[PDB]
Amino acid sequence: KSPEELKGIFEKYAAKEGDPNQLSKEELKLLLQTEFPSLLKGGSTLDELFEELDKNGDGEVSFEEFQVLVKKISQ
């Protein structure tokens, strides 16, 4: 992965729902399962993770909010 690849996959997935800039809980779950099947679990539920990421509580994880996911997987 890399910022470019992450943005690419993010956008590619996102595009099927909400808006290319925003991964819905569903689209997020699809991405997560594809890219990070293990890490997505970690020690929390999809709901908890989703909430943690979408701090803004708009309904989707924006590319901005997704940086938290990037940070988590990096760490």
Side-chain angles (χ1 to χ4, degrees):
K1 268 64 180 181
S2 59
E4 185 179 87
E5 289 171 285
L6 288 161
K7 192 176 183 180
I9 299 295
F10 173 98
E11 191 177 284
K12 187 182 72 176
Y13 271 63
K16 276 87 76 172
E17 295 187 46
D19 176 285
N21 174 64
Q22 282 134 248
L23 285 168
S24 60
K25 183 180 286 181
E26 181 180 0
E27 199 60 55
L28 175 72
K29 182 51 173 291
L30 295 175
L31 187 161
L32 289 178
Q33 284 168 114
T34 314
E35 310 307 308
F36 320 112
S38 44
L39 316 183
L40 77 87
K41 308 187 192 304
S44 304
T45 66
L46 169 59
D47 301 272
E48 287 172 321
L49 179 59
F50 168 78
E51 290 166 63
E52 185 186 61
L53 296 175
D54 183 16
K55 300 176 65 174
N56 186 48
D58 58 71
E60 311 94 68
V61 174
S62 64
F63 184 59
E64 182 180 64
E65 294 277 55
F66 194 73
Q67 303 314 293
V68 180
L69 185 279
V70 177
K71 190 179 186 299
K72 288 297 197 73
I73 65 174
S74 301
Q75 266 57 221

